[PDB]
Amino acid sequence: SPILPGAWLGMVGGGQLGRMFCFAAQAMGYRVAVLDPDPTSPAGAVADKHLRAAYDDEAALAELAQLCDAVSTEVPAASLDFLAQSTFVAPAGRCVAIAQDRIAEKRFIAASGVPVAPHVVIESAAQLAALADADLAAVLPGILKTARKGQVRVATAQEARDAYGSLGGVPCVLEKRLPLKYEVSALIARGANGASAVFPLAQNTHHGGILSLSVVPAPAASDALVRDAQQAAARIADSLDYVGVLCVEFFVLEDGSLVANEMAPRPHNSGHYTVDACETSQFEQQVRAMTRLPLGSTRQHSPAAMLNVLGDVWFGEPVTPPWDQVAAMPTARLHLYGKEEARVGRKMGHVNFTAATLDEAVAGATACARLLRIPL
């Protein structure tokens, strides 16, 4: 039964993505309650109600579940399950619990018939001690990552062991480094009735572990590769009975293989382009999935790219970037977060670039990046 406009929707989490969700929900006539302990919550600021409380505050959770016909997130899975005792929660705590845990991700993604990188799970110091040097070496060189940037690049058994001790004896996964050619992400929505809507494939670059540029449709990817990555994302959502928006990031290797890297159980930075390029944005899809409305059209009307703008662009004292010169660019769509303080590494906004042709969109992104001194 669909949850119609006029209902209250809840959002657990109140950063910029929550604020984007609030816009999309309110534009469809829903009321939005945000749960977020931050008194300066950007999403709380724009919401019809801001519950300023911890994510594990049972009184606040109980108030959110009473008020809201459905709840989503942008969190402890136990808070989700607590809410789901009383209201509809999409994506479900189980799905968030999986996506959140790199060991679980490996297990459930493989069980959906999707390749993952070679890896050795290291649950505890005891298991590490049982693993021989030669066992660790089978996935080296690699990166040791905590299951829950707790990542250390390692090249020898001893380096792996020292890294593991350094991360505190928590569950980890040791992942083999593969010969990466380029990265892509698939962005899909799945409804409670099993219907699916999938966006075009994004091609993504990162610097310092942070997304820099997305280009859509992915220029390097064959039709075949696009189908495989879209299908892989659908398979995971279907296998998990996922309700909501899911972003699956992949590596494409030098030999052309597709390998799933990580998944986010929510709208994702690599999907911001959808607001300006597609018929339905990723945030409207989150609204539709959680309300059991029909999913929206994912038609991409305009070739697109997206550039992240970090606080780096303001730098010793902050200097306002030349936004007038960006706005002169006919392809540029400004999304600036209105944050008081520029800081290195902090997402201050993004700029989407849309045009009749992808070459025009990419040229705008490139010109903008040169203007703002954003590394590509």
UniProtKB/TrEMBL annotation:
Keywords for the protein's UniProt record, in alphabetical order: ATP-binding, Ligase, Lyase, Nucleotide-binding, Purine biosynthesis
Substrates-to-products reaction catalysed: 5-amino-1-(5-phospho-beta-D-ribosyl)imidazole + hydrogencarbonate + ATP = 5-carboxyamino-1-(5-phospho-D-ribosyl)imidazole + ADP + phosphate + 2 H(+)
Binding site residues for ATP: R102, K145, E175, K176, R177, L178, E183, H206, N261, E262
Functional pathway: Purine metabolism; IMP biosynthesis via de novo pathway; 5-amino-1-(5-phospho-D-ribosyl)imidazole-4-carboxylate from 5-amino-1-(5-phospho-D-ribosyl)imidazole (N5-CAIR route): step 1/2
GO biological process, one term: 'de novo' IMP biosynthetic process
Keyword Ligase: yes
Entry's Gene Ontology cellular component terms: cytosol
Domain ATP-grasp: from-to ranges: 106-291
Class in the EC hierarchy, top level: ligase
Function per UniProt: Catalyzes the ATP-dependent conversion of 5-aminoimidazole ribonucleotide (AIR) and HCO(3)- to N5-carboxyaminoimidazole ribonucleotide (N5-CAIR).
HAMAP family, per the entry: PurK (MF_01928)
Subunit structure: Homodimer.
Protein name: N5-carboxyaminoimidazole ribonucleotide synthase
Organism of provenance: Burkholderia thailandensis (strain ATCC 700388 / DSM 13276 / CCUG 48851 / CIP 106301 / E264)
Top-level taxonomy: Bacteria, Pseudomonadati, Pseudomonadota, Betaproteobacteria, Burkholderiales
